[PDB]
Write a protein that binds this ligand. Structure first.
Ligand SMILES: Nc1nc2c(ncn2[C@@H]2O[C@H](COP(=O)(O)OP(=O)(O)OP(=O)(O)O)[C@@H](O)[C@H]2O)c(=O)[nH]1
Ligand SMILES: [Mg+2]
Lengths: 18, 180, 177, 415
């Protein structure tokens, strides 16, 4: 773990925007 | 103390030697240095400063510091005389007007107590036209026989042809190195 | 001290020459007048090591105004270094040529400046533009005679966009004065 | 257009100087110290000094003043930017900013200074590019500087492509002594530590209010940053055209975007201060802190600094949650809290005596500031949509990012 918010996975783009 | 390391170094060759490049401007000093180091007639501009290089022959690395014969560079020849063991003089056999200037410069350089252990080394430059003098006329004009306590040898070298450079190098090596 | 440093600089050992150069640089940075040793370091200037060349150039630049007469023995070295294959060496030589505040030094550097004006390397082009701007600031008449205004103007419409920006800044500085 | 940039010391000794134009004599630096001393003693000291017709602009460094003497009317902003770039390069190359490294890396320092700028015009400013050509322990200049892409070095190879992002939030609240917040602005910070193979071009996508409105999705929680500053690698053309955040990520930690907008929400921590100071008899510290943040968010390492009396001594603390320590150097008591869950209410009761002799001069009322830092909290509500990582060779990236909320200019005016 790490202080200041755990790292989270990010997407590649907005899949709902086509 | 022990001299085993010195003997081991001298068994395969350790002596290097030194040399100087002096003479009148445009007398083939830079061309002679290029031929001695590289071996080709390389065209260069006037020697505003100086040319520093080293030549390896017969297991001796005789570094040659070419110095131009210009008025602004003639007084700078004393800077290169420090820590210098050899001196090579480039004569202009095709430049009769500059012959007197070259002789005066050589006499002034030889009249210094610092440059006393260096043997005379005059190269008969401009050995490409019939107007060039022989190995005795140039020496007589320069008065090489009147230099007491100076080992001077007359050698004719042509920048375009390159002949005579080996003889001058051998004479300089014999004058400096006196071993088997 | 001074005698020992001069003896070390007048030697043929690369490590000793480097140590002497470092000591001279430290003394100069600490506030020591090392300009009297500039003629001694003139002989130990043409060195293969890049670190020693930079220190020698810095000493000459800092000892050029102090000893303008002793700076006349560096035109040949600068000319030789201006054709170095390494772009870093050429850029350093161009910067040192323009940084030398010698009236008679920039006159003989016009040919190297013209040669480096058309340098293909963007860093080389930027260095040439900076040297041209420095020469124009030192001598506007010399810059005009050398015709560097046309080269500076054409540098803007070329590649090396950082080089183009350097040339544009140099042209603006010339026009500013 | 500074004539020469030099690095000074705390005692006035110049650690290192390098003239760029030669139009300013190096002896003008000596007069800079007396001028600075006179200005400080009279309150007229300014970072941009003026020695006659030559201006000696100086920046207060960690141990020495970065004095950049100038002669003509050079670009002050350009000089400041060059000084900041030089400071950043020195910090990257040398981890310590003091006299220890100034005189220890002079051989490489001189080369770096020479390569950085020539004739007063900076040329090299990339830390990675400078380190790839100038090292303290030389080849030709890298083609990255000559090429257009000077912020993403080509040919980088890594075993794995992992990028660590950091959603840094700065909660600045300016609460006056009357109890009303005057300056309440939150400045975002999108810093990503990209460590991959090659020179991928990041395709940034987030839940931006402007982007949502343009795409027709302006109905969900969208972050409306009043001021958004892109990084050097970020292309401004795409952002101006359609808000497309397309740029080559840097090799390492870099700041891609930095949001900056006003905050109209209640403060995450509500602090009520009471000063029951007797007339040279005793002092009362009725400090009550209320956590306005969500209960699911805990403020880690919260340090609410309460300025105590300058001459106060023998203080007694009567608090409920959080240890209170009085630092004589700071002349204040900081309400240090290890973990502060949202909605927590901490009450403190300070009590200390005062000297019989009254003070000769007033000391002022410094504002009370807290050092709360609650991570994993998104107060602004801006959610990142996706990060378009595209490489010519083709690889599967696994970027990571963490949202961190801290207290910035959260100062409360004293009574
Ligand atoms: N064509 C030709 N020229 C020669 C010959 N021997 C000497 N020279 C002259 O020698 C000069 C060589 O010039 P550099 O290479 O610059 O060296 P330098 O003799 O020291 O001349 P400076 O640099 O001006 O001091 C040429 O300019 C020629 O005029 C020769 O055999 N043939
Ligand atoms: Mg020559």
């Amino acid at each position: 773990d790490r202080k200041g918010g755990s790292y989270s996975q990010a997407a590649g783009s907005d899949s709902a925007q086509s | 103390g022990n001299i085993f390391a010195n003997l081991f170094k001298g068994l395969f060759g350790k002596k290097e030697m030194r040399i100087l490049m002096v003479g009148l401007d445009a007398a083939g000093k830079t061309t002679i240095l290029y031929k001695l180091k590289l071996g080709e007639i390389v065209t260069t501009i006037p020697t505003i400063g100086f040319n520093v290089e080293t030549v390896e022959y017969k297991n001796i690395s005789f570094t040659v510091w070419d110095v131009g014969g210009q008025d602004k560079i003639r007084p700078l020849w004393r800077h290169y005389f420090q820590n210098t063991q050899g001196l090579i003089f480039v004569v202009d056999s095709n430049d009769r007007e500059r012959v007197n200037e070259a002789r005066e410069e050589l006499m002034r350089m030889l009249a210094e107590d610092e440059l006393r252990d260096a043997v005379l080394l005059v190269f008969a430059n401009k050995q490409d036209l019939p107007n060039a003098m022989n190995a005795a006329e140039i020496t007589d004009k320069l008065g090489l026989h009147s230099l007491r306590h100076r080992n001077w040898y007359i050698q004719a070298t042509c920048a375009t042809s390159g002949d005579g450079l080996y003889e001058g190098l051998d004479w300089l090596s014999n004058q400096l190195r006196n071993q088997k | 001290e001074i005698f020992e440093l001069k003896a070390e600089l007048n030697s043929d050992k690369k490590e000793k020459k480097k140590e002497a150069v470092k000591k001279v640089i430290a003394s100069m940075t600490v506030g020591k007048d090392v300009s009297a040793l500039f003629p001694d370091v003139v002989n130990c200037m043409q060195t293969d090591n890049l670190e020693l060349k930079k220190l020698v150039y810095l000493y000459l630049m800092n000892y050029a105004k102090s000893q303008p007469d002793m700076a006349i023995m560096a035109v040949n070295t600068f000319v030789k270094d201006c054709e170095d294959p390494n772009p870093l060496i050429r850029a350093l030589a161009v910067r040192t040529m323009g940084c030398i505040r010698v009236d008679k030094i920039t006159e003989y550097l016009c040919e190297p400046l013209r040669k480096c004006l058309k340098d293909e390397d963007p860093y080389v082009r930027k260095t040439a533009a900076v040297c041209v701007a420095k020469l124009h600031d030192i001598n506007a008449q010399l810059v005009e005679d050398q015709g560097f205004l046309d080269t500076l103007k054409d540098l803007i419409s070329d590649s090396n966009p950082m080089v183009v920006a350097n040339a544009v800044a140099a042209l603006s500085e010339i026009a500013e004065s | 257009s500074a004539s020469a940039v030099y690095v000074l010391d705390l005692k006035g000794k110049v650690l290192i100087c390098r003239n760029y134009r030669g139009d300013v004599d190096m002896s003008e630096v000596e007069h800079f110290m007396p001028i600075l001393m006179e200005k400080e003693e009279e309150g007229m000291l300014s970072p941009i000094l003026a020695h006659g017709g030559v201006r000696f602009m100086w920046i207060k460094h960690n141990n020495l003043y970065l004095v950049a003497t100038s002669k003509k009317n050079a670009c002050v902003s350009l000089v400041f930017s060059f000084l900041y770039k030089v400071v950043q390069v020195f910090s990257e190359y040398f981890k310590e900013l003091e006299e220890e490294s100034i005189r220890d890396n002079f051989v490489i320092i001189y080369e770096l200074l020479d390569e950085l700028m020539d004739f007063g015009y900076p040329q090299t400013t990339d830390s990675k590019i400078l380190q790839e050509y100038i090292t303290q322990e030389a080849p030709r200049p890298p083609a990255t500087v000559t090429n257009a892409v000077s912020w993403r070095s080509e040919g980088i190879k890594y075993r794995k492509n992992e990028v660590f992002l950091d959603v840094i939030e700065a909660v600045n609240l300016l609460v006056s002594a009357n109890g009303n917040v005057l300056r309440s602005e939150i400045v975002g910070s999108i810093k990503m530590r990209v460590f991959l193979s090659g020179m991928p071009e990041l395709r940034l996508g987030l839940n931006d209010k402007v982007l949502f409105d343009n795409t027709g999705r302006g109905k969900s929680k969208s972050v409306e940053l009043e001021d958004v500053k892109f990084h050097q690698c970020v292309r401004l053309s795409r952002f101006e055209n359609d808000r497309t955040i397309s740029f080559i990520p840097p090799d390492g930690e870099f700041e891609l975007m930095s949001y900056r907008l006003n905050t109209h929400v209640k403060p995450l921590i509500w602090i009520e201060s009471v000063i029951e100071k007797h007339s040279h008899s005793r002092i009362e510290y009725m400090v009550k802190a209320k956590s306005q943040f969500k209960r699911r968010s805990t403020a880690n390492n919260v340090e609410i600094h309460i300025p105590v009396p300058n001459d106060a001594d023998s203080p007694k603390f009567k608090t409920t949650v959080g240890s209170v320590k009085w630092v004589p150097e700071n002349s204040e008591i900081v309400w240090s809290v290890k973990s502060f869950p949202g909605g927590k209410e901490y009450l403190m009761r300070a009590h200390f005596g005062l000297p019989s002799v009254e003070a000769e001069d007033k000391e002022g009322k410094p504002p009370i500031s807290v050092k709360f830092e609650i991570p994993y909290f998104t107060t602004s509500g801006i959610q990142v949509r996706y990060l378009k990582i595209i490489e010519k060779s083709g690889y599967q990236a696994l970027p990571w990012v963490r949202y961190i909320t801290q207290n910035g200019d959260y100062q409360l005016r004293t009574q």
